[PDB]
Short mmCIF file of C-alpha atoms and ligand atoms in Angstrom, two decimals:
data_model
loop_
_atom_site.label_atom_id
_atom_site.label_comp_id
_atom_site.label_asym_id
_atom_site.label_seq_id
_atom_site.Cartn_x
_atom_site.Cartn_y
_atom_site.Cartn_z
CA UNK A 1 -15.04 11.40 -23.36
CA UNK A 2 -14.12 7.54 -24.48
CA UNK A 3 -11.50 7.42 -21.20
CA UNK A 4 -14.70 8.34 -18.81
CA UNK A 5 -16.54 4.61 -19.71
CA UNK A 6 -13.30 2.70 -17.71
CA UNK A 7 -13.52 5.33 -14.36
CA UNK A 8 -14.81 5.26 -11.08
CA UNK A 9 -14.82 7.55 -8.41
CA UNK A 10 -15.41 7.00 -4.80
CA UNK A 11 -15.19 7.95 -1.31
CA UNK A 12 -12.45 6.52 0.92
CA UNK A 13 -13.22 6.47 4.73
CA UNK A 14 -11.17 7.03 7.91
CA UNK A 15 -9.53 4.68 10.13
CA UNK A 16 -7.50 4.26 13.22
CA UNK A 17 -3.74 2.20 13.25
CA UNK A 18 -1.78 1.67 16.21
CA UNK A 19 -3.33 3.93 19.21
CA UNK A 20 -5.94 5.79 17.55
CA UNK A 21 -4.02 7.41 15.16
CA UNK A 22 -6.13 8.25 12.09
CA UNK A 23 -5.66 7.65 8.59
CA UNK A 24 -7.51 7.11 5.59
CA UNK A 25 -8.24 3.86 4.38
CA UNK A 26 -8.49 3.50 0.33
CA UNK A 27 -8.50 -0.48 -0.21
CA UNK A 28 -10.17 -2.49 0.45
CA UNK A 29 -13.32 -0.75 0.23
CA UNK A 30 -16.78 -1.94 -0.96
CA UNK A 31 -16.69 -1.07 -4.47
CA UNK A 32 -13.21 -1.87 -4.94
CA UNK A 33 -10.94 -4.88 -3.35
CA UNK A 34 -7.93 -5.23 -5.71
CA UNK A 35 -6.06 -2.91 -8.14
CA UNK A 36 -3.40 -5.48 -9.74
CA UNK A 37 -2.08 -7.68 -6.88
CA UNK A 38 -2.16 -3.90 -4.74
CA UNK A 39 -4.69 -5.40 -1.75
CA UNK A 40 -4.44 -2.52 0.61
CA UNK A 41 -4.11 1.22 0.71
CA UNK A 42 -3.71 3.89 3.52
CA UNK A 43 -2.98 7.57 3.47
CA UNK A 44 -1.47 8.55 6.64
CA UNK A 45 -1.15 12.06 7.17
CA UNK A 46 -0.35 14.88 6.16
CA UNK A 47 -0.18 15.69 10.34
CA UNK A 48 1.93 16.70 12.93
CA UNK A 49 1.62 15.81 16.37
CA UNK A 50 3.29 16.78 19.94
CA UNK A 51 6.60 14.66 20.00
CA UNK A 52 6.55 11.07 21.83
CA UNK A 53 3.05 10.85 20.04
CA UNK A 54 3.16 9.25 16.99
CA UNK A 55 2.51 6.41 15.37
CA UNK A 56 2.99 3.05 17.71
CA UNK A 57 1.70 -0.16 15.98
CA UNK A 58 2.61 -2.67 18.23
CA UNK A 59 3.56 -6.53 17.35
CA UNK A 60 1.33 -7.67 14.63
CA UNK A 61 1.23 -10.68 11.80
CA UNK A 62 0.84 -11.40 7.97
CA UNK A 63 0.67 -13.42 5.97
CA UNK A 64 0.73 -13.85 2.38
CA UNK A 65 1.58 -10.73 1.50
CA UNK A 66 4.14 -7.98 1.15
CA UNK A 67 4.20 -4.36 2.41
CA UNK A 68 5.11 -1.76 1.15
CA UNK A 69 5.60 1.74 2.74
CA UNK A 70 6.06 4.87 0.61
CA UNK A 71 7.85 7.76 3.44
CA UNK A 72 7.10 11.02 2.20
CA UNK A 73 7.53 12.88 5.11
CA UNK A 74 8.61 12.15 8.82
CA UNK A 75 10.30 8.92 9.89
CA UNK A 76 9.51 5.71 11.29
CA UNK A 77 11.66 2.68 13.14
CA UNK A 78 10.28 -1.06 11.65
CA UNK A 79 11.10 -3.84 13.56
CA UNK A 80 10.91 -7.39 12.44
CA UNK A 81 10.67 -11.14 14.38
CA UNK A 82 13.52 -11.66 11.69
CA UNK A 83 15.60 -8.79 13.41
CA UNK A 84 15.12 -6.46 11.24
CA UNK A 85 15.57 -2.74 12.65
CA UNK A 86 15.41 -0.11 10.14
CA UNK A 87 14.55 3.50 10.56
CA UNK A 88 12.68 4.93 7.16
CA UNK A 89 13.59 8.74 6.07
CA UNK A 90 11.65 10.39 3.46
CA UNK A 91 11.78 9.61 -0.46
CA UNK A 92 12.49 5.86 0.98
CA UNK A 93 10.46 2.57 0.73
CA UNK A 94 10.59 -0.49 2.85
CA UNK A 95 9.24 -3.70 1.06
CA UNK A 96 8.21 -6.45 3.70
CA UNK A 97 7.93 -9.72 2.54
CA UNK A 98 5.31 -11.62 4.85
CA UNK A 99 5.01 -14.82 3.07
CA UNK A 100 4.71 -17.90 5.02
CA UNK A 101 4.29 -15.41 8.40
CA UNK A 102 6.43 -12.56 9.79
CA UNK A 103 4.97 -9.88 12.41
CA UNK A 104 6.59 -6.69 12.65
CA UNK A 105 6.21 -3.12 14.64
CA UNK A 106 6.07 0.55 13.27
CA UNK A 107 6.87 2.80 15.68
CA UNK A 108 7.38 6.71 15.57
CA UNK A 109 11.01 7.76 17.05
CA UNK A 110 10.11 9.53 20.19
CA UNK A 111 11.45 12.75 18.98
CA UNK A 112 9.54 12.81 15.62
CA UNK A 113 6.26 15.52 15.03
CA UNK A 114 5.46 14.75 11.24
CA UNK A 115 3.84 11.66 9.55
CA UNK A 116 2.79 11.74 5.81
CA UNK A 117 3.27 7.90 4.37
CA UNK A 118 1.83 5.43 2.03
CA UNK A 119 1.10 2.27 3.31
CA UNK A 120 0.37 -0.79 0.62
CA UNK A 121 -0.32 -4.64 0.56
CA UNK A 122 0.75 -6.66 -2.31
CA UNK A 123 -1.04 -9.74 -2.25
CA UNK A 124 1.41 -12.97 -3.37
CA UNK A 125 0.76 -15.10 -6.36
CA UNK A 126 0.08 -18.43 -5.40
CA UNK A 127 3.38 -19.86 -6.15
CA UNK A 128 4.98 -17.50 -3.71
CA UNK A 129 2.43 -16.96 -0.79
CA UNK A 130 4.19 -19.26 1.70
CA UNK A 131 7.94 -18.18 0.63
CA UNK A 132 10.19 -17.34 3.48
CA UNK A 133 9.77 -13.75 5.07
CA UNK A 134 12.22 -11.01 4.28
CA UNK A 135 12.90 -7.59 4.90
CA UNK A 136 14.24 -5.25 2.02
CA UNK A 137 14.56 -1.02 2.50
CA UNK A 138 15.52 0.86 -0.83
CA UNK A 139 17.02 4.48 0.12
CA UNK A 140 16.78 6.01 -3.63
CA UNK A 141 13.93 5.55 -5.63
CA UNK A 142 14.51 6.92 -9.18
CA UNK A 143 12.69 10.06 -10.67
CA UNK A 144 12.13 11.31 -14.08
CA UNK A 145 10.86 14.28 -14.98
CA UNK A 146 9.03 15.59 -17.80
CA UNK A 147 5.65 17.77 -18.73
CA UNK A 148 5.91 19.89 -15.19
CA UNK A 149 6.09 16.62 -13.25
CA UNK A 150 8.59 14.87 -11.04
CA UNK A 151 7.97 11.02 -11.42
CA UNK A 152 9.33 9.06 -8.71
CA UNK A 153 9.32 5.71 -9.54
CA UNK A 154 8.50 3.18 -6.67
CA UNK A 155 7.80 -0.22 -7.99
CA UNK A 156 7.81 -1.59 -11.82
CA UNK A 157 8.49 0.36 -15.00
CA UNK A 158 6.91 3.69 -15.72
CA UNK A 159 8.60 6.58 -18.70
CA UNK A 160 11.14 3.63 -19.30
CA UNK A 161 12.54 3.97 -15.69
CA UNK A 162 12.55 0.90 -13.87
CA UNK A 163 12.51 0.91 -9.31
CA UNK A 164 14.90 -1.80 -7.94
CA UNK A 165 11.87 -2.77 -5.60
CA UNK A 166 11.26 -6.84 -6.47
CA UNK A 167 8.00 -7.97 -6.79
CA UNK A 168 6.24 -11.24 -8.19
CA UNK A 169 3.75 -10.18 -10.55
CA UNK A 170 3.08 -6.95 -13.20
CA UNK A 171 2.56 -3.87 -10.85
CA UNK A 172 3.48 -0.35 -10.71
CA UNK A 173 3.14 2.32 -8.59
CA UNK A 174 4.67 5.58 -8.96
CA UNK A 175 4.78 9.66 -7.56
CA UNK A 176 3.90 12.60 -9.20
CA UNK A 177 4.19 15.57 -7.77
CA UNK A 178 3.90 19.02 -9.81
CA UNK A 179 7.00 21.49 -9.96
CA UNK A 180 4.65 24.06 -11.78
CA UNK A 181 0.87 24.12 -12.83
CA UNK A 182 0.52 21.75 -15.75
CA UNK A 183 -1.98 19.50 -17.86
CA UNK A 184 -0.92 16.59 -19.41
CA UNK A 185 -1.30 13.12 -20.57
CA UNK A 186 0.45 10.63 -19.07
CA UNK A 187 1.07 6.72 -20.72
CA UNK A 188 -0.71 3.56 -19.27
CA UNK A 189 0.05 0.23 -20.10
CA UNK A 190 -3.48 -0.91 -21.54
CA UNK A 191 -3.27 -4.89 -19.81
CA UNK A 192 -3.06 -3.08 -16.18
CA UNK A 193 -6.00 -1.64 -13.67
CA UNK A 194 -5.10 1.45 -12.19
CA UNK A 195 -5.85 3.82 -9.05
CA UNK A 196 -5.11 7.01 -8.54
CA UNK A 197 -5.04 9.17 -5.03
CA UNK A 198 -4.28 12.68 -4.03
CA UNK A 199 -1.36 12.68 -1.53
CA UNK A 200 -1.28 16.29 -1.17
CA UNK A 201 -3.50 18.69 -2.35
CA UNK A 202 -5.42 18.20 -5.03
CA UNK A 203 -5.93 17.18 -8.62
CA UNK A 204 -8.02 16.11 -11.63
CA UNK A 205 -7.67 12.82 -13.73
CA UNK A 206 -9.84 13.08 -16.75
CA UNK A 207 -11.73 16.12 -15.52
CA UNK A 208 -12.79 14.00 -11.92
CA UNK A 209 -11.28 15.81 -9.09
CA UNK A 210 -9.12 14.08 -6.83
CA UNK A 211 -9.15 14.78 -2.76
CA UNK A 212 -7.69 13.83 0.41
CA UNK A 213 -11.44 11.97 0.49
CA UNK A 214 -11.50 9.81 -2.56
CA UNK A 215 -9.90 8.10 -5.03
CA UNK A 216 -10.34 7.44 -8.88
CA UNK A 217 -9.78 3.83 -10.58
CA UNK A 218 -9.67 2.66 -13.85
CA UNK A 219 -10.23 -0.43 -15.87
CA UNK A 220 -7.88 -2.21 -18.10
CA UNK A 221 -8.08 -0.90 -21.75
CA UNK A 222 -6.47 2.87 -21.56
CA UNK A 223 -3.49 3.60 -23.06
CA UNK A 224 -3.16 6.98 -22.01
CA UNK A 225 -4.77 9.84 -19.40
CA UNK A 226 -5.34 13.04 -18.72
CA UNK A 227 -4.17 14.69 -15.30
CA UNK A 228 -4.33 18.35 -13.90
CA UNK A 229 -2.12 19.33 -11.16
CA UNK A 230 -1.16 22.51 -9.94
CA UNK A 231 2.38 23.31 -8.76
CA UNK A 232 3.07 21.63 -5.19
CA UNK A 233 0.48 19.33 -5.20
CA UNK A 234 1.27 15.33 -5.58
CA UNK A 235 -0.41 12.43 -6.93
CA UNK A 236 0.01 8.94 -6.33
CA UNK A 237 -0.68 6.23 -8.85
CA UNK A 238 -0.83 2.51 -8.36
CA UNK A 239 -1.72 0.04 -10.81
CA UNK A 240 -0.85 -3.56 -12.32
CA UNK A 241 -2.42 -6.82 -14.06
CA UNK A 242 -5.79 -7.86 -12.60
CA UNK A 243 -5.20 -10.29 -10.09
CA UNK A 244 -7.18 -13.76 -11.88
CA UNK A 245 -6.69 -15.64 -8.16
CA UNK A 246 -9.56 -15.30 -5.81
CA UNK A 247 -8.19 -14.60 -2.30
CA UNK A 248 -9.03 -14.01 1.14
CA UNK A 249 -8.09 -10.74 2.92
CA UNK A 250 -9.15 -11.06 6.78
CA UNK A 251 -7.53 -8.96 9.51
CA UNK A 252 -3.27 -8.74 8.54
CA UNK A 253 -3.84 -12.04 6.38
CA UNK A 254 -4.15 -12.51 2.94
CA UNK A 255 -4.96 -16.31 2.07
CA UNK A 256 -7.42 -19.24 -0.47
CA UNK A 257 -8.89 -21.04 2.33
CA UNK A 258 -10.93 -20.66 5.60
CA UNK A 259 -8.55 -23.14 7.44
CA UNK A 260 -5.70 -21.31 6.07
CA UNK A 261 -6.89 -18.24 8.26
CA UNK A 262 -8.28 -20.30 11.38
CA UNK A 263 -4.91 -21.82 10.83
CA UNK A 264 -3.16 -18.77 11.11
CA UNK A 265 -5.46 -16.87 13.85
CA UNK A 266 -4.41 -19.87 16.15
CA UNK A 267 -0.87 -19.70 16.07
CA UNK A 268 -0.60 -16.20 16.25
CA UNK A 269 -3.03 -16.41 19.92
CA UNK A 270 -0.87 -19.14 20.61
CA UNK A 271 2.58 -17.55 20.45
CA UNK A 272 3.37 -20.14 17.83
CA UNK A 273 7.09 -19.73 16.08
CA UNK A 274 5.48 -18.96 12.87
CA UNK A 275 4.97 -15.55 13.85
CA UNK A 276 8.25 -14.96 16.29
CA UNK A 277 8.81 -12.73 18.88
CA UNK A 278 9.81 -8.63 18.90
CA UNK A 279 11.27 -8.74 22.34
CA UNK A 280 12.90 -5.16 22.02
CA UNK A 281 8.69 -3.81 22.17
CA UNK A 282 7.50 -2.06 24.83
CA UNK A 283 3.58 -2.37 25.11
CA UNK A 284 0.79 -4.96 24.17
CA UNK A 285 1.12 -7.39 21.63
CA UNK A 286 -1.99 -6.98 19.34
CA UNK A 287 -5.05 -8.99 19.66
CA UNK A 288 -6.88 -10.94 16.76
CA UNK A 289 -10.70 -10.30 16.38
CA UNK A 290 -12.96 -13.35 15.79
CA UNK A 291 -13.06 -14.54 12.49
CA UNK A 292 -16.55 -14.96 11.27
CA UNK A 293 -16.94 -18.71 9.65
CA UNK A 294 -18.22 -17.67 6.22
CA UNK A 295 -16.02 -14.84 4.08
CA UNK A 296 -16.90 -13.56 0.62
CA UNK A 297 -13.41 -13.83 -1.66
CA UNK A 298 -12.22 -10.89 -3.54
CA UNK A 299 -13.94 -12.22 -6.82
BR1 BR B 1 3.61 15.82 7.38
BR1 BR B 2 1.77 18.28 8.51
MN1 MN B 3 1.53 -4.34 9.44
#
């Protein structure tokens, strides 16, 4: 009853990646831009597709930002402009620090059928958005487990178990999945803004059903909630200290300023070494749309 005045529910949409594969897009959306510094959210899969056909994102910027991919199941081969080659396996993350300007490619090994991922943006504070790109992959996340759930801890602190994936400001993000039907509370730090989305299956967070079609937030102020989840089915929670910077998410760039993004948009059409080259990619570089001249920010 008294959690139900800090929750929202809505409807996430679909949306293609790479060469029309589909996904569901969670954040930004119009009633929500930012959970913590967490500017971006897409479910990819559950699916499984003919071999040679999955996922090819070709070379692409960003700026400002990190990314963050959570593999749950299938693989995928990242590529970097700093070199970077690094095939993820499932239970793995790969944290991609953008800063100042990277561009990177995800593409499918030719062999693999299965894609069920994760894929976040962490906008930078301000006095780290134009740091120098880097590339960090973490092969064991830690898990704890407790109340019929199997926490696996990807970023921050959560049941005093800490992930060894560095960020720059309070954030937390973290996956539940059930090992038998249970309902429970589960702690929440009360300074942080939270989001919560079914991976697999379903589930229920304060009595609001969660599907492959929504998602449920929260505002700052709970220190605990409610969750149902029946055995199998997984849950993933992301969360972290409201973001007090305005910023400006437009295409692959996060950013403060107009010119920062007509900036940007300009040297990546121009080839400019900000952005580097993936010369190991076979295919089409991809294309910028216009950028309109006005822009709301995210507050
Ligand atoms: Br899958
Ligand atoms: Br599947
Ligand atoms: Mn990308």
């Amino acid at each position: 009853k008294f959690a139900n005045q800090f929750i929202q529910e809505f409807p996430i949409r679909s949306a293609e990646i790479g060469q029309g594969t589909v996904i569901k897009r969670a954040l930004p959306s119009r009633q929500k831009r930012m959970i913590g510094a967490w500017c971006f959210l897409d479910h990819a899969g559950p699916v499984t597709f003919p071999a040679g056909n999955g996922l090819d994102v070709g070379p692409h910027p960003h700026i400002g930002l990190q990314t963050f991919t959570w593999m749950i199941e299938g693989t995928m081969m990242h590529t970097d402009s700093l070199g970077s080659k690094q095939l993820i396996r499932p239970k793995q993350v790969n944290l991609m620090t953008a800063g100042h300007g990277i561009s990177h490619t995800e593409v499918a090994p030719d062999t693999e059928t299965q894609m069920h991922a994760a894929q976040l943006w962490i906008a930078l504070p301000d006095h780290k958005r134009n740091m120098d790109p880097k590339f960090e992959h973490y092969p064991d996340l830690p898990v704890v487990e407790k109340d019929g759930l199997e926490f696996t801890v990807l970023v921050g602190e959560y049941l005093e178990t800490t992930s060894p994936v560095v960020v720059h400001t309070p954030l937390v993000g973290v996956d539940l999945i059930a090992t038998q039907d249970t309902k429970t509370r589960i702690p929440l730090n009360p300074e942080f803004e939270y989001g919560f989305m079914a991976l697999d299956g379903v589930a229920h967070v304060n009595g609001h059903e969660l599907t492959a079609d929504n998602m449920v937030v929260l505002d700052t102020g709970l220190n605990e909630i409610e969750i149902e989840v029946k055995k199998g089915n997984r849950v993933l929670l992301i969360g972290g200290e409201p973001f007090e910077t305005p910023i400006l998410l437009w295409w692959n760039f996060v950013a403060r300023t107009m010119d920062d993004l007509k900036e940007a948009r300009e040297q990546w059409v121009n080839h400019d070494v900000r952005f580097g080259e993936i010369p190991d990619y076979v295919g089409a570089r991809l294309e910028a749309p216009v950028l309109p001249d006005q822009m709301r920010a995210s507050k």
